[PDB]
Amino acid sequence: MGKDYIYAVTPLLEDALMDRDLVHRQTASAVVQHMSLGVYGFGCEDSLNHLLNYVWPNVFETSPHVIQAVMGALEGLRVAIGPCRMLQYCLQGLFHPARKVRDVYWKIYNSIYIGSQDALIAHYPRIYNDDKNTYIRYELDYIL
């Protein structure tokens, strides 16, 4: 029943996520998680993606409570919006040069792949064949 009020609470959560204190970001991450799990399957993915545009910069936090809230918000956003946008967010950082940044991105991608192992095949990026092995599948190019 929250879909009438998602657009009302969107700028409040947007102002809360930009706060200096980690408590506001953690509790707003819990807000995004419960709001994403609440009205899943109702077409409110634009405001959820807009909130994810503020949540996903906060993945570099080191405190355990706020990073647990960030992981729960990422799980709720991957349930609600879909694994395609999470794969789009993680594809440019899974092969990051930094060890810690690519480790955190690999943790998020491993959680997304545990949750969405079946649906990630159709949302896999279109990469051509290289010198190591063939990559472009010809079964998807078949038309009947």
């Binding site: 879909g82 192992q117 279109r126 472009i136």
Partner: protein, 1164 residues
């Protein structure tokens, strides 16, 4: 937008099927999963036709289907392995005619994951345990035990997961009364991943691993592990115990090896090849479809060859080792993905393309004209017994269930003259291909009309002992016609009643003498030319005719009723007591009296003074009006029938009053239905009695379970309504119009005209108004290529004798595609044919042939851009095209003049290109997209005049839609990219891009900024561009307005009304044989009521597969403003307590919800 998508044409392509005693009785039950819905059929083998007993939609993707029976149980429970992680074992209830889930045990996550079990399912042969294994590195087996109430008590499964161990196939072996065991075709993958040189991948081979389920020890251990040289593409189990040895048989390319549990003879029998086959020998023959049939004493197997012929192999076990397997081709059948050999003369083979075949196996399997190859018969390891293609001798085909899967293209239009528009879908694979035109009428599959312009149509049967109407008298004022109920209704004079006078009615009231009410009176007429006629009451003719079993009441003007009772000699005797009603009775009917009474209990006649009088037809209460029914207006008809009995008087206006027909006067209730007078009479429909009121709409008050309800029907325009029964259907509704009779089944008839090759796209010419279809069966030999290969084989085997005669017979008369399959091979070769089918009939009025390596993909027949108004068609064909992997030469676009006003495919010239120009549409010039390069090239007769081409696309453009100054192209990565079609400015700039990656294979623009896409994972996504977007800009995305999953790979979509009138929705045809219309809901309150009903039904009725409806409808991407009509249809099919609970949750009535669903269905 709020779209309530509903599927009209269901997918019928059965991907898998099982059979057994799943019906709980001696009747054989076969359950076939036709996609998202599984249908269980128990057809009669004496009739031979296949009829589906029930069908249930589970809303999921089934990866493995199996059935199993317990120890001594007469019912075979079905264990379904779906995409959800809950394995469901269900028992079919024949009393409810549906499957009830006995148990549902959760195993893992939903979807078709790699480590998720459910890809392979098997059961123990002794009914001890059921094993579910994944595609890789996961397996489990739960022990199934009988409870105290003979219930399937499930158990916790034991873990059988090994690191990097893929499974090809698995089957539970027959261990008898001992501990059960299951064999699997394991393949190691750790050494192939570890070794980078690829030597371990070549060194790897399939191994038969038989693991014994130690039920006493409560553990699972691998008993035997035998490495096999041949890779196992299939696996079957021989019937152990009294039907033969306990072992397995692994099939490969012309090598079937049988091994038992221990030391057995590895009889590597070669496959019996065809006698001088036209197919290439490089393609190996393997048992794709295997069916082991065990008799009371012996057992046998049925296998599918490379040509598709069903071969029967006997089991010469001889109690020691696998010695012989007499592999003889039993019959020639079509291309079947799976075949099942049932008992009692039944053999079902599910065709992957075309009609599945349900044959009657009358013989014992030895009635085959083909040669026999035995496993004990030695050979030189180069050939077997040449099994020539024999006819259907051992098993005769008795049912051909037509299936549209696979589907290629479709187009629906009201070009033909019919009650409904014609949807012509060009589809098929190889030479097994056709264009099926489907049209509806209600179900008017057979059209029968009464002769002339009759006043009434009454069944005057020869006798009451005869079940069929021997003489359906269609009687007019001038003459009459006799038409039998055999779906051959024509004028004849075999009635014998001599109906030259104007007969009001003629019905078989007596045992052999039909009572006919006419201007002469009441005449008892037998089957011969004898009619004893008694006069009507008074000098006026009888207008109202209450007809019953023994007593018939003829009411003339003034309400004077004369009662004709059934005499002991069979004639009709007039009663000595008569009385007049209040006014002149218009029409009448009599209630169905019981067999103990010698007369009618209550015969009701409706006068013109807004009243109906019901009187007892017995001699003790003769001429005494008992029940008075108060009509609202002046009654034009009356009808007394069962549901005790009730009499309804219908008026000339829209008001009919029904009261209780009894010895006392009952309460009269008035109800409304077409500005026509009433002609209500008793009829039978859907197992219920009804009175059909004559109006503009098909209104029939049906009294089902003592509840008279009148609702409109979806028939054609008519002025009267009645019942009908003939050879086509047992009980239907006949809507009688001006010299027409609409038939309502209380479906759409499809006729398939065959084509040359497998179709690719259908194009209708503008000048011709005829479909210039292109058939391109790729990765197969062309007809000229097969003729050249047959000539080369005849030249090679001409030098020998009988080999030259065999080569000439194989070249002249090869294996046909209708019986034994057309022998075709190759990869770059393709059968191409351009055929012109007229709008009147689907026969080919023209034929254009291409090269043997070319496949025609682009089909567009319109006027030429470079030339004038001449309809020059540019058809694109890719030459030497191989699907897997990418290997093509180039695409040639041929321009054709389309002579004889488009009825002749006269090719003018052609022009080649390196890329594939499969997209060619008119754009101000014409937009032709070859590869990633789309050019606005004028349609020249010799060659196109390309002006500007841009190659900024990702991979290609599989489909381009345009409405003016803009072209939206569907790429491999992006679902829709819109480029501003500035043909005057000669500049190509991409106006709009997309962010959601989808391999869109369809296009249907609902608006200028709206683009539809059908992804490769079967997702329908309608995306609109953002408002206030600049046309001369770039780097702008389009938001997805709606996204849904249809459960099948959607092929095409067109934003046009698929029904006459109603709602102009969008119709999408899928590749699995499904067609669905996405009706946009323009009412917010109706959309909210549908959403509340869907939210109630998602919790009240769970799916059979165990997956959620929202999870199944949003598998690829999340759903957005999409409502599925399958749950709305299944809500009306629920139980009455569940419907009452859903109506209480929705704060309405269940009949009101059913009426709202019927209005949503009739909105179209």
């Amino acid at each position: 937008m709020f779209l309530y998508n509903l599927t009209l044409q269901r997918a019928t392509g059965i991907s898998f099927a099982i059979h057994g005693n799943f019906s709980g009785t001696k009747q054989q039950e076969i359950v076939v999963s036709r996609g998202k819905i599984l249908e269980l059929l128990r057809p009669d083998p004496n009739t031979g036709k296949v009829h589906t007993l029930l069908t249930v939609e589970v809303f999921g993707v089934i990866r493995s289907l199996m059935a199993f029976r317990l120890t001594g149980g007469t019912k075979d429970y079905i264990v379904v392995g779906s995409d959800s992680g809950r394995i469901v074992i269900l028992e079919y209830q024949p009393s409810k005619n549906m499957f009830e889930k006995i148990h549902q045990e959760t195993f893992g996550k939903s979807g078709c994951r790699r480590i998720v079990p459910g890809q392979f399912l098997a059961v123990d042969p002794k009914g001890r345990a059921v094993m579910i294994s994944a595609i890789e590195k996961q397996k489990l087996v739960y022990i199934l035990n009988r409870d105290a109430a003979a219930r399937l008590t499930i158990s916790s499964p034991l873990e059988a997961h090994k690191a990097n161990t893929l499974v090809y196939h698995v089957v539970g072996v027959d261990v008898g009364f001992e501990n059960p065991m299951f064999a699997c075709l394991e393949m190691d993958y750790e050494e192939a991943d570890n070794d980078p040189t690829g030597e371990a991948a070549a060194n790897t081979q399939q191994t038969l691993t038989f693991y014994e389920l130690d039920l006493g020890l409560n553990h699972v251990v691998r008993k035997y592990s035998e490495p096999l040289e041949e890779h196992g593409n299939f696996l079957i189990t021989v019937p152990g115990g009294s039907d033969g040895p306990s072992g397995v048989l692994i099939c490969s390319e012309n090598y079937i090896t049988y091994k038992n549990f221990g030391d057995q003879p590895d009889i590597r029998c070669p496959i019996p090849r065809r006698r001088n086959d036209l197919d290439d020998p490089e393609r190996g023959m393997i048992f794709v479809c295997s069916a082991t049939h065990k008799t009371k004493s012996m057992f046998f197997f049925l296998a599918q060859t490379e040509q598709g012929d069903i071969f029967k192999i006997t089991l010469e076990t001889d109690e020691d080792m696998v010695t012989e397997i007499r592999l003889k081709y039993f019959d020639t059948v079509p291309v079947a993905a799976a075949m099942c050999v049932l008992k009692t003369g039944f053999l079902f083979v599910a065709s992957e393309f075309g009609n599945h075949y349900l044959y009657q196996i009358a013989h014992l399997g030895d009635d085959d004209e083909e040669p026999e190859f035995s496993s004990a018969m030695p050979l030189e390891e180069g050939d077997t017994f040449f099994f020539q293609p024999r006819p259907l001798k051992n098993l005769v085909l008795v049912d051909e269930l037509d299936s549209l899967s696979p589907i290629l293209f479709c187009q629906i239009a009201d070009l033909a003259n019919e009650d409904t528009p014609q949807l012509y879908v060009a589809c098929g694979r190889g030479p097994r291909s056709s264009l099926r035109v489907l049209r509806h009428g209600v179900s008017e599959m057979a059209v029968s009309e009464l002769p002339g312009n009759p006043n009434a149509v009454w069944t005057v049967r020869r006798h009451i002992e005869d079940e069929f109407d021997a003489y359906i008298i269609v009687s007019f004022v001038n003459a009459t016609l006799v038409l039998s109920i055999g779906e051959t209704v024509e004028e004849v004079t075999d009635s014998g009643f001599l109906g030259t006078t104007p007969t009001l009615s003629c019905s078989l009231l007596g045992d052999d003498a039909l009572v006919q009410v006419y201007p002469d009176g009441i005449r008892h007429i037998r089957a011969d030319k004898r009619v004893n006629e008694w006069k009507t009451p008074g000098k006026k003719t009888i207008v109202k005719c209450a007809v019953n079993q023994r007593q018939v009441v003829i009411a003339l003007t003034g309400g004077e009723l004369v009662y004709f009772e059934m005499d002991p000699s069979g004639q009709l005797n007039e009663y000595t007591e008569r009385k007049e009603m209040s006014a002149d009775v218009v029409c009448m009917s009599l209630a169905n009296v019981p067999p103990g009474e010698q007369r009618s209990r209550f015969l009701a006649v409706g006068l013109v003074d807004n009243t109906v009088r019901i009187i007892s037809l017995d001699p003790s209460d003769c001429l005494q009006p008992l029940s008075m029914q108060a009509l609202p207006a002046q009654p034009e008809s009356l009808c007394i029938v069962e549901m005790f009995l009730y009499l309804n008087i219908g008026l000339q206006n829209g008001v009919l009053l029904r009261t209780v027909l009894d010895p006392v006067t009952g309460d009269l209730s008035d109800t409304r239905t077409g500005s026509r007078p009433v002609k209500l009479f008793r009829v039978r429909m859907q197992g219920q009695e009804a009175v059909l009121a004559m109006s503009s709409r098909s209104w029939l008050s049906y009294s089902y379970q003592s509840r008279f309800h009148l609702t409109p029907l979806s028939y054609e325009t008519l002025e009267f309504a009645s019942g009908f029964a003939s050879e086509q259907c047992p009980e239907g509704i006949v809507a009688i119009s001006t010299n027409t009779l609409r038939i309502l089944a209380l479906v759409f008839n499809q006729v398939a005209f065959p084509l040359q090759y497998t179709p690719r796209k259908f194009v209708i010419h503008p000048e011709s108004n005829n479909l210039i279809i292109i058939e391109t069966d790729h990765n197969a030999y062309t007809e000229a290529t097969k003729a050249q290969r047959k000539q080369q084989m005849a030249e090679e085997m001409v030098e020998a004798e009988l080999a030259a005669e065999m080569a000439a017979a194989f070249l002249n008369e090869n294996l046909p595609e209708s019986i034994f399959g057309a022998p075709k091979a190759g990869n770059g070769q393709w059968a191409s044919v351009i055929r012109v089918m007229n709008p009147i009939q689907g026969n080919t009025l023209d034929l254009v042939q291409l090269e043997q390596n070319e496949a025609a993909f682009s089909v567009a027949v319109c006027r030429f851009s470079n030339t004038g108004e001449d309809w020059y068609v540019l058809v694109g064909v890719a030459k030497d095209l191989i699907l897997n992997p990418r290997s093509v030469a180039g695409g040639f676009v041929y321009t054709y003049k389309l002579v004889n006003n488009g009825e002749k495919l006269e090719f003018l010239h052609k022009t080649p290109v390196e890329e594939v120009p499969a997209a060619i549409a008119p754009f101000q010039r014409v937009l032709i997209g070859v590869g990633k390069l789309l050019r606005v090239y004028d349609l020249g007769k010799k060659k196109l005049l390309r002006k500007c081409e841009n190659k900024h696309i990702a991979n290609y453009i599989s489909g381009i839609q345009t409405i003016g100054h803009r072209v939206i192209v569907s790429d491999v990565q992006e679902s829709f990219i819109w480029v501003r079609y500035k043909r005057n400015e000669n500049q190509l700039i991409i106006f709009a891009d997309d962010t959601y990656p989808r391999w869109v294979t369809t296009a249907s623009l609902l608006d200028y900024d709206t683009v539809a896409g059908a992804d490769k994972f079967g997702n329908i996504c309608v995306v609109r561009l953002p408002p206030n977007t600049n046309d001369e800009v770039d780097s702008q995305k389009a938001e997805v307005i709606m996204n849904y999953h249809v459960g099948e790979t959607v092929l095409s979509l067109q934003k046009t009304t698929l029904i006459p009138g109603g709602s102009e929705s969008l119709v999408y045809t899928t590749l699995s044989g499904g067609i669905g219309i996405l009706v946009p809901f323009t009412s917010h309150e109706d959309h909210d009521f549908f959403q509340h009903v869907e939210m109630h039904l998602r919790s009240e009725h769970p799916p059979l597969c165990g997956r959620d409806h929202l999870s199944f409808r949003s598998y690829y991407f999340p759903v957005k403003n999409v409502i599925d009509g399958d749950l709305c249809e299944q809500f009306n099919s629920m139980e009455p307590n569940k419907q009452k609970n859903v109506s209480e949750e929705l704060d309405r009535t269940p009949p009101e919800v059913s009426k709202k669903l019927e209005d949503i269905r009739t909105r179209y």
